[PDB]
Ligand binder design. Sequence first.
Ligand SMILES: CCc1cc2c(=O)[nH]cnc2s1
Length: 282
Amino acid sequence: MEMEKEFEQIDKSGSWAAIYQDIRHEASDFPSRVAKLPKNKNRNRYRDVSPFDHSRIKLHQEDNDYINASLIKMEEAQRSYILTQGPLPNTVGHFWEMVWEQKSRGVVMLNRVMEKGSLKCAQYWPQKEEKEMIFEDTNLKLTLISEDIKSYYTVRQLELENLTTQETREILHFHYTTWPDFGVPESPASFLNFLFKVRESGSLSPEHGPVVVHCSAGIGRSGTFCLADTCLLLMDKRKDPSSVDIKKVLLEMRKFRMGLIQTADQLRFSYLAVIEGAKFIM
Ligand SMILES: CCc1cc2c(=O)[nH]cnc2s1
């Protein structure tokens, strides 16, 4: 079926939970043996969210190459994304090592450091220009260059230096700051505006490594971001845009990382975002 009328048909019939459970039943199951090794317990935020072995990002290190991060490669859309958990106190150096080694231009953050009164990720970037951060375990230096605070999101320019080679690179940090503590946003308008700002920066384009996107677990809000982006790109590429099947795209992405889209409300919100976004594109 088309999207917008499939949408109204699920609303009127109140069957979002059944649709979402079907997706959960059909989703791929691949091994995640490296994630579960005992030496990696303090590298995982949640015991039930792990990268598959076949698509995990490897650190260029011979001691321990493990990080909780996955490469999502979308062949028809010609887009790639790295989805990862919010960094932990003992993985902030690994996080920036990955950004460096994978040649990423942008980092997309969809959570606040504290939500619901608890810490959802480490304070992994510097908050003042004159107070830079050094990650001694991976030999990187990170400096805040500039910060632009808007009503729904903040953009930061960061400098990452590889202290071993003295090479430097400019990284863009796109921080969506207004996702509510409970539920999903009422309108997708500010989320779509944010997606378009990431796109306009070059951070999603083939001349760079894959964008790094995270929330707390790296599957829920993060899944909504890449699912909406890929669906809108396919609607632009194909002769028949109504042939884009959001459930099929989501199942394809779940071949690369488990659990993408965590609730039936996130599923409904993803439909809403793609529907509204397709009108603005034209
Ligand atoms: C001025 C260009 C824009 C495109 C776009 C979109 O596709 N979705 C949401 N906001 C915008 S702004």
